[PDB]
Ligand binder design. Structure first.
Ligand SMILES: [Mg+2]
Ligand SMILES: [Mg+2]
Ligand SMILES: [Mg+2]
Ligand SMILES: [Mg+2]
Ligand SMILES: [Mg+2]
Ligand SMILES: [Mg+2]
Ligand SMILES: [Mg+2]
Ligand SMILES: [Mg+2]
Ligand SMILES: [Mg+2]
Ligand SMILES: [Mg+2]
Ligand SMILES: [Mg+2]
Ligand SMILES: [Mg+2]
Ligand SMILES: [Mg+2]
Ligand SMILES: [Mg+2]
Ligand SMILES: [Mg+2]
Ligand SMILES: [Mg+2]
Ligand SMILES: [Mg+2]
Ligand SMILES: [Mg+2]
Ligand SMILES: [Mg+2]
Ligand SMILES: [Mg+2]
Ligand SMILES: [Mg+2]
Ligand SMILES: [Mg+2]
Ligand SMILES: [Mg+2]
Lengths: 153, 67, 70, 117
RNA sequence: AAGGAGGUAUUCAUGUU
RNA sequence: GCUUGAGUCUCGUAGAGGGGGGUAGAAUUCCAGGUGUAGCGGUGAAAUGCGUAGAGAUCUGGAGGAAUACCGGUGGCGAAGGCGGCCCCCUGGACGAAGACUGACGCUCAGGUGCGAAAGCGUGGGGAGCAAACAGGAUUAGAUACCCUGGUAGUCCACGCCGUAAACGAUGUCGACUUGGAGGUUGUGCCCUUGAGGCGUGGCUUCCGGAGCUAACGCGUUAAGUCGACCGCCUGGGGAGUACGGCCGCAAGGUUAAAACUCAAAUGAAUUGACGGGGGCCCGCACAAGCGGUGGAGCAUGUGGUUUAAUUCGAUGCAACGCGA
């Protein structure tokens, strides 16, 4: 908006976990407004991931999310007539959103059968730092370093 | 402001007076403008002639990348 | 613009000091103006126009500093 | 091979390209590096980053001589003009002098004509 | 290159630096 | 006859005013040598070009030509063109102070004479850099250009010729009178210079502005105001500053300067819009950040086209095409 500085909409916490971050994850996963199905998938995936990789669902989810969070991204400025790909530091709320979005899309792509199984596998893989999501994060970091020469435009 | 020469009623710069010329030159060796220094126009011209004569006699450097 | 690193002087401070010295010397401006040959007519015209612009805005400020903005 | 532990870094920084040359105090050149050798071409070789990597390449080249002290002579109106100095400091030489040696004429030869673009 | 301040711009002890 | 206009003398002041001759440092180029090695150079991007016979870079020495950074200033000087490192020689003008002197010796000026940027011409030198022409590489539909790499006349010097410029303040020279303000520059008088100050009195110069003038724009004590003296020039636009003739010129050409024919306008200033690959400011799912699509498949539907005896007619950039229906 040219003239509007209202912030972000207040979102309610997750019923079964009281986590705003988890609620946003459910919203990102949800498609066609079918929140019940997405919530069941994430709950089952979290329980499976907890049993496999550690102690509690929130701890496993946060460690995976941190392993996927990007420090810096790149945007396309246009000052010298041509377009310069310049790196830019991402604000923390955007870090969480990008991490969750990357995890969800990577899980969708995977070839496993059940969506909950795909989500649990991807979360564990991201925690172990071999997943497609962490690969995506490393790719964006790699490109940012490549075009770091334009960091003062 | 505060033209120094007219304060003492100086008639001529007397280029042999190096210390005054050192005040009225920059570190790089060029002449500081009268706009910055505050010197009057007549004394500025006399000062420029004195500095150039001193540069020829090698009492002042033309530049700092000379010797 | 000769600069020698002073005793107990940080390198970043020294580098900023060197840039300040170069700015005061006016080296980049001089070489850039000497990059191409400006005709004497162009030089005189440019100088005169700049003086006119400076004088005009001085008068404008000194006059319009006696008006009600609101 | 003959260790001297003090060098002079001549940084010729033109608009198009930057050439860094490490030499002895007397004038004999030890090693050099340029953005063209760094691989950047044209619009990318006229950037400060290319100058930085060329300075790093030159520092590696003259690493055999084991030079510790380094006085810097920067010359020409080049895009970087400073990234080379930062790169040398990062490479780990003690920068002794930072000197500008741009050749400014006292109204000498006539420059080429102005470009009409 | 971008933002802030002062002016038509300097006096603002030298020393120090 | 007189001294107020004009001029002379006495003492000083500032100035890139002019001519001649030396000299200084920076820088470019080239040459010789050392170090050192694979790029340099150039552009929006490239190539031509240069470099392994060693470039570019870096250091040392040498040669040569041209021009004088900073100071530098809507600062100064000159009739105008124009004049910019420093020093010396020759030389012109302007201004201030106090007086003394001559006694209208003044102003303007057709012909005439001289000076007169740059380019150009003749003869002879010089030649670093720059650079018409030219050569090559690009760009483009074409590119006899803009861009890039080279590059000859020329630019420099001596002596002649040329004599034209938006040679412009687009404002002829001389003189007198008419409210002001802020500056710059250069003299000079007085007041305790109460220390950089205060009050006068000249010369030149920039801006703003009153009356007045002007078509308006604007000028405005440096007039485009109110007047006086002399000179030059205009008579609608094109044809045309062209033809012919004369004069000048080595030439290029310059100067003086028409007519037929043709049109009913050509022009100046200012006004309201629209536009600008002008400038500032602002807004809109305009972009950006996101989610979901269309464009691929099948089918439904509308249109175009083609076909038909008829495929009824209309809507057909956005703002027609599941529209009238
Ligand atoms: Mg060029
Ligand atoms: Mg004058
Ligand atoms: Mg006559
Ligand atoms: Mg000529
Ligand atoms: Mg000739
Ligand atoms: Mg000749
Ligand atoms: Mg050319
Ligand atoms: Mg050339
Ligand atoms: Mg004429
Ligand atoms: Mg003229
Ligand atoms: Mg005329
Ligand atoms: Mg006359
Ligand atoms: Mg006026
Ligand atoms: Mg004629
Ligand atoms: Mg003509
Ligand atoms: Mg004739
Ligand atoms: Mg809306
Ligand atoms: Mg979009
Ligand atoms: Mg289709
Ligand atoms: Mg159609
Ligand atoms: Mg129809
Ligand atoms: Mg129809
Ligand atoms: Mg519709």
């Amino acid at each position: 908006p040219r003239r509007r500085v209202i912030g972000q909409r207040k979102i309610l916490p997750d019923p079964k976990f009281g986590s705003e971050l988890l609620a946003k994850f459910v919203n990102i996963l949800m498609v066609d407004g079918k929140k019940s199905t997405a919530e069941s998938i994430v709950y089952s995936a979290l329980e499976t991931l907890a049993q496999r990789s550690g102690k509690s669902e929130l701890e496993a989810f946060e460690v995976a999310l941190e392993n996927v969070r990007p420090t810096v991204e790149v945007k396309s400025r246009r000052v010298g007539g041509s377009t310069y790909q310049v790196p830019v530091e991402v604000r923390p709320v955007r870090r969480n959103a990008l991490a969750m979005r990357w995890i969800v899309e990577a899980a969708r792509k995977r070839g496993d059968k059940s969506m909950a199984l795909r989500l649990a596998n991807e979360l564990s893989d991201a925690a172990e730092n071999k997943g497609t999501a962490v690969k995506k994060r490393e790719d964006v970091h790699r490109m940012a370093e490549a075009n770091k020469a334009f960091a003062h435009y | 402001k505060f033209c120094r020469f007219t304060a003492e009623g100086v008639q001529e710069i007397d280029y042999k007076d190096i210390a005054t010329l050192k005040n009225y030159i920059t570190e790089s060796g060029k002449i500081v403008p009268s706009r910055i220094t505050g010197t009057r126009a007549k004394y500025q011209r006399q000062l420029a002639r004195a500095i150039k004569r001193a540069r020829y006699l090698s009492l002042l450097p033309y530049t700092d990348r000379h010797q | 613009p000769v600069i020698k690193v002073r005793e107990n002087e940080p390198f970043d401070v020294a580098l900023r000091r060197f840039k300040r010295s170069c700015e005061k010397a006016g080296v980049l401006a001089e070489v850039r103006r000497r990059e191409f040959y400006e005709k004497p007519t162009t030089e005189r015209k440019r100088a005169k126009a700049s003086a006119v612009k400076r004088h005009a805005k001085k008068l404008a400020r000194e006059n319009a500093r006696r008006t009600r903005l609101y | 091979r003959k260790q001297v532990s003090d060098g002079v870094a001549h940084i010729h920084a033109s608009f198009n390209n930057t050439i860094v040359t490490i030499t002895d105090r007397q004038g004999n050149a030890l090693g050099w590096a340029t953005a063209g050798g760094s691989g950047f071409r044209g619009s990318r070789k006229s950037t400060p980053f290319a100058a930085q990597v060329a300075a790093e390449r030159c520092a590696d080249a003259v690493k055999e001589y084991g030079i510790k002290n380094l006085e810097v002579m920067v010359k020409g109106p080049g895009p970087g003009r400073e990234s080379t100095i930062r790169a040398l400091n990062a490479a780990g030489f003690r920068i002794t002098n930072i000197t500008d040696v741009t050749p400014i004429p006292h109204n000498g030869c006539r420059p080429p004509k102005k470009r009409r673009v």
